[PDB]
């Protein structure tokens with residue numbers, strides 16, 4: 001997260017750190033007791049590593065009573081996702097068992113009605129991604145409030161040039177933005193999950209290249225299908 005602040009410890013109980021060989025790789029969000037939603041390009045960069053999900057965490061390295069590292073029974077990338085596109089960039093991770101719920105660990109309600117979040121709406125994105133251009137990785141969860149950006153502006157040639165489909169949404173990126181390591185994490189609006197930080201490489205904090213998030217509402221049937 002760029003231009004954000006350290007988050008209040010365990011105030012976002014749905015926040016997950018998807019890890020590869022003990023190292024934070026991507027953000028994720030607990031959407032059911034045994035399922036965490038993240039981005040597909042994340043586990044692309046795996047296949048040759050152990051994928052786990054850390055829940056109830058604030059600090060990645062320090063002990064915390066609510067922290068628990070879960071193994072993953074099955075990784076389910078969206079069937080239509082492709083290495084060179086930013087479409088259908090979702091991945092569902094089935095934990096080895098239902099997560100122990102508590103004040104620090106709880107699934108977040110997610111949007112099932114397919115209607116766009118109104119432009120200007122302030123949404124929250126959190127993550128353990130880089131915090132500056134040098135690539136500094138924070139030990140604890142950071143977050144930033146970002147206003148949703150209308151799709152037409154986001155699609156202008158000067159911005160994302162038509163790449164934003166109805167299944168994608170944008171948030172402003174003027175100095176405040178999600179960045180490398182935050183991909184797969186949640187964009188929460190009004191206490192409901194609306195988007196998943198896309199995981200295509202992108203410049204951070206440049207208002208001319210808005211943040212791109214996959215709209216969960218657009219994939220409600222697929223998520224339901226996988227958790228069936």
Ligand SMILES: *[C@H](O)c1ccccc1N
Pocket residue numbers: 041178179180181182183184198199200201202203204
């Ligand atoms: C997610 O994978 C991401 C987000 C912002 C910038 C770069 C990357 N890789």
